[PDB]
Amino acid sequence: PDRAELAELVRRLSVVRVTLSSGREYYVDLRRATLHHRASALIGRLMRELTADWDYSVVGGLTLGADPVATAIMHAPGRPIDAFVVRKLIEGSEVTGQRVLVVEDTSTTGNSALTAVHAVQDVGGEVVGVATVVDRATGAAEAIEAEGLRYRSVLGLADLGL
Amino acid sequence: HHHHHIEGRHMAGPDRAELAELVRRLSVYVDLRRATLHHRASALIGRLMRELTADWDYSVVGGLTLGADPVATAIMHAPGRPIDAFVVRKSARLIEGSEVTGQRVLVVEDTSTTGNSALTAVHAVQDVGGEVVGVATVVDRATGAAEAIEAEGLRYRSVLGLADLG
Ligand SMILES: O=P(O)(O)OC[C@H]1O[C@H](OP(=O)(O)OP(=O)(O)O)[C@H](O)[C@@H]1O
Ligand SMILES: O=P(O)(O)OC[C@H]1O[C@H](OP(=O)(O)OP(=O)(O)O)[C@H](O)[C@@H]1O
């Protein structure tokens, strides 16, 4: 019900003929939903449920995509979880000595979320897993699991109705 | 110091004094991000900035990344009428998130020093046809930012002042 409402809002808000960054070939603009009053609340609530079995006190990722996902999780009802942001180094709550959830809005390569995992690691945080709003079946899952980390997402590529 | 009026004085109560506590503890020698990205302080920030700006008409809230962002999302997530958010990039789209064109907008900032960051976000919004109804900050530090904001004919309001920070 929530997941269905979220998926509808994402197709509606974020699946927007286009010359890409690539030079190739709709495109997905996840920030239209992560910065939307309702979608962002659903994101916060579903991401908590998605990672309930994990142990972490602090959530964040690489600016900019990850930031409203992290704060949406911090604000959504439930137990206290603080937030941070990785610049391009760490801002917001202390991750040093901490259990950290790394988030992304949607990964392509996983580089961004990884840059974020390593920036956390290089200052002493322990990363427990990576969670994203939308997986797009692009290899990010695989790249992330190739460093010992669990990867999960709320929605998959099917939910985008492509 | 160039002391400016702190409109947040008038909404005294438990929420304001708790937040002032949290900002002294987490942020003071001053790192506001520790409060803006903190679960309780951010939630109070959302509640209070909504209250501070209740007589203002806007449907979207945001400012210049990074400082503005957790203040904007805090407002968006707090209880009450639906308010969406956006983020002005330092460079690029330039404005990311919800649509601001033809909208009434609140620009926010965690704390301003010169006012340059907030005025940058304001101008970026105007340039894409958004209407900025004011600027609100969490903490004013009597630095002259409020005057620079007001010199363009914008309204300005803050929740806390220097005195709330010790
Ligand atoms: O790094 P990858 O796993 O390939 O992911 C592609 C990235 O593209 C977007 O961020 P973008 O590069 O647009 O930067 P922004 O977050 O500053 O907009 C999105 O948030 C992804 O993190
Ligand atoms: O003189 P002003 O333009 O009013 O600037 C005041 C800003 O300075 C600080 O951030 P900082 O610029 O250090 O970091 P950021 O740009 O990454 O938010 C603070 O968070 C305010 O946003």
Side-chain angles (χ1 to χ4, degrees):
Chain A
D2 283 353
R3 189 187 182 288
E5 194 190 336
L6 180 64
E8 273 156 15
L9 281 160
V10 180
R11 293 188 274 280
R12 182 162 74 66
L13 291 175
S14 295
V15 184
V16 319
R17 275 281 256 143
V18 203
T19 322
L20 300 179
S21 208
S22 291
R24 296 265 206 197
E25 82 221 10
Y26 89 80
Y27 76 102
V28 188
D29 183 4
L30 247 171
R31 292 99 202 268
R32 286 172 204 201
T34 61
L35 288 165
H36 180 268
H37 70 277
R38 179 51 174 171
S40 66
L42 287 175
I43 282 151
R45 182 199 301 155
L46 295 165
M47 294 274 278
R48 287 173 92 105
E49 186 168 351
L50 191 79
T51 54
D53 53 303
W54 295 342
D55 173 51
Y56 62 91
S57 63
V58 73
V59 67
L62 193 68
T63 196
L64 192 50
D67 303 351
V69 179
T71 62
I73 289 161
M74 167 169 74
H75 290 114
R79 66 178 189 86
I81 302 162
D82 304 314
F84 60 94
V85 181
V86 191
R87 323 167 70 92
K88 297 167 154 146
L89 228 75
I90 294 195
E91 303 273 23
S93 324
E94 173 156 284
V95 296
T96 291
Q98 305 303 312
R99 291 181 84 80
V100 175
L101 170 61
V102 171
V103 301
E104 187 64 287
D105 59 357
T106 183
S107 285
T108 305
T109 61
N111 284 356
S112 282
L114 286 177
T115 300
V117 167
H118 301 160
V120 172
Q121 282 166 351
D122 295 13
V123 311
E126 135 153 354
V127 181
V128 317
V130 175
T132 71
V133 183
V134 177
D135 184 84
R136 293 192 290 100
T138 50
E142 278 78 18
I144 293 314
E145 309 206 297
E147 312 210 353
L149 299 155
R150 305 193 247 283
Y151 175 85
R152 308 204 185 153
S153 63
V154 181
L155 302 184
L157 187 77
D159 299 312
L160 299 175
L162 299 173
Chain B
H1 285 131
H2 313 277
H3 294 278
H4 195 274
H5 177 72
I6 308 292
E7 183 68 19
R9 287 155 68 75
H10 292 313
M11 49 183 208
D15 293 323
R16 195 186 178 273
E18 198 187 342
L19 175 69
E21 266 270 44
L22 297 164
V23 171
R24 288 190 295 271
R25 271 128 106 142
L26 303 151
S27 302
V28 174
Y29 318 177
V30 48
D31 184 27
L32 256 187
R33 279 81 191 284
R34 291 240 186 81
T36 62
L37 295 153
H38 182 272
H39 72 282
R40 177 65 183 165
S42 68
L44 290 169
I45 287 171
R47 185 185 288 155
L48 292 167
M49 291 282 281
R50 284 172 89 118
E51 193 184 335
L52 175 70
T53 56
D55 55 342
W56 292 356
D57 179 11
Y58 58 97
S59 63
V60 77
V61 58
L64 204 75
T65 201
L66 185 148
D69 307 352
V71 178
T73 54
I75 288 164
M76 162 172 85
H77 297 295
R81 75 190 175 81
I83 303 174
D84 303 306
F86 65 93
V87 167
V88 189
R89 305 181 96 108
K90 294 161 192 309
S91 64
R93 316 183 273 149
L94 202 72
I95 302 182
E96 290 281 21
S98 300
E99 201 44 70
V100 308
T101 299
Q103 302 308 287
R104 294 174 68 80
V105 166
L106 181 63
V107 174
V108 303
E109 187 52 281
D110 53 6
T111 194
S112 285
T113 293
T114 56
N116 289 5
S117 58
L119 291 175
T120 299
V122 162
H123 299 160
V125 172
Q126 293 165 332
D127 282 30
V128 306
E131 199 195 326
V132 182
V133 308
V135 175
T137 69
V138 178
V139 186
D140 188 272
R141 284 173 310 119
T143 179
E147 291 75 13
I149 308 308
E150 291 169 354
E152 306 201 349
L154 301 150
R155 303 195 295 277
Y156 177 88
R157 282 182 190 167
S158 183
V159 178
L160 302 177
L162 240 32
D164 297 286
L165 302 192

